[PDB]
Amino acid sequence: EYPTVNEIPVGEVRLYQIADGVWSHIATQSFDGAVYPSNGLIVRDGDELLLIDTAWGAKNTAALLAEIEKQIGLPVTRAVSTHFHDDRVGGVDVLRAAGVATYASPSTRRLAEAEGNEIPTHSLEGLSSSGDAVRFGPVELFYPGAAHSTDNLVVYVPSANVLYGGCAVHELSSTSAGNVADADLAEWPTSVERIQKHYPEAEVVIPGHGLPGGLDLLQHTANVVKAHKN
Numbered sequence: 001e002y003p004t005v006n007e008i009p010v011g012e013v014r015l016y017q018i019a020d021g022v023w024s025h026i027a028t029q030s031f032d033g034a035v036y037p038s039n040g041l042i043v044r045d046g047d048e049l050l051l052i053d054t055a056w057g058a059k060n061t062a063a064l065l066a067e068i069e070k071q072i073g074l075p076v077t078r079a080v081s082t083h084f085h086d087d088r089v090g091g092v093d094v095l096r097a098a099g100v101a102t103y104a105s106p107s108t109r110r111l112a113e114a115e116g117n118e119i120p121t122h123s124l125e126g127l128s129s130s131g132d133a134v135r136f137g138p139v140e141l142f143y144p145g146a147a148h149s150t151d152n153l154v155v156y157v158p159s160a161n162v163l164y165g166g167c168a169v170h171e172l173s174s175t176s177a178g179n180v181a182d183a184d185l186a187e188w189p190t191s192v193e194r195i196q197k198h199y200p201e202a203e204v205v206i207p208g209h210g211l212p213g214g215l216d217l218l219q220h221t222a223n224v225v226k227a228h229k230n
């Protein structure tokens with residue numbers, strides 16, 4: 001029942017319950033003339049919500065806030081963007097205007113600035129070295145090393161054993177490494193192996209685009225990246 005790309009018009013946002021106090025958000029957006037689905041995460045933080053990633057653009061992110069208000073009814077107080085591309089930061093200005101404090105690593109903020117993308121307000125120190133982990137409310141943020149991008153972070157929800165891989169992790173049906181313009185194909189399998197080693201108890205793995213599954217998404221991603229390489 002997870003929503004697919006052809007089931008969500010561009011501009012609409014769906015929420016999907018992953019575990020108690022954990023949802024994914026699903027949106028669609030047009031990029032270089034093709035439409036893609038994209039996931040983010042919502043994690044309950046007492047009587048507040050932590051958001052992971054925007055819904056890929058200003059209009060989608062406004063729709064995301066409206067869907068959260070309707071379905072959950074708890075305020076989003078903080079957001080983390082997991083890398084500098086528009087499917088993660090596009091909509092940060094909408095969040096910042098709505099009273100959401102926006103965060104990203106200094107690596108993500110520098111790359112977003114250089115690219116002309118929206119820039120989260122606050123900088124997340126303690127994530128500059130591969131294998132670094134920091135606590136942020138109900139989640140752990142982990143920097144696995146360069147993969148889809150040099151700044152990509154992954155997010156673990158310890159209470160639910162949910163691993164949100166962002167664009168460093170591909171869905172099982174994926175046949176390509178996607179947009180590799182900013183990727184490190186050689187380090188990506190090593191970065192996946194660091195994720196596998198650090199989160200062996202993950203029950204749900206959510207990719208940046210497409211269907212959640214289990215731990216197999218990690219190995220599949222290393223395989224996809226190898227097939228792209230040659």
Ligand SMILES: Cc1ccc(-c2cccc(S(N)(=O)=O)c2-c2nn[nH]n2)cc1
Pocket residue numbers: 031036085086087148167174176177178179180208209
């Ligand atoms: C199979 C597939 C998945 C996603 C995309 C995609 C489409 C638009 C924008 C991006 S991003 N985050 O700007 O680089 C991506 C992407 N590629 N890999 N991760 N995200 C393309 C193909």
Ligand SMILES: [Zn+2]
Pocket residue numbers: 083085148149167
């Ligand atoms: Zn990306």
Ligand SMILES: [Zn+2]
Pocket residue numbers: 085087167208209
């Ligand atoms: Zn992506």
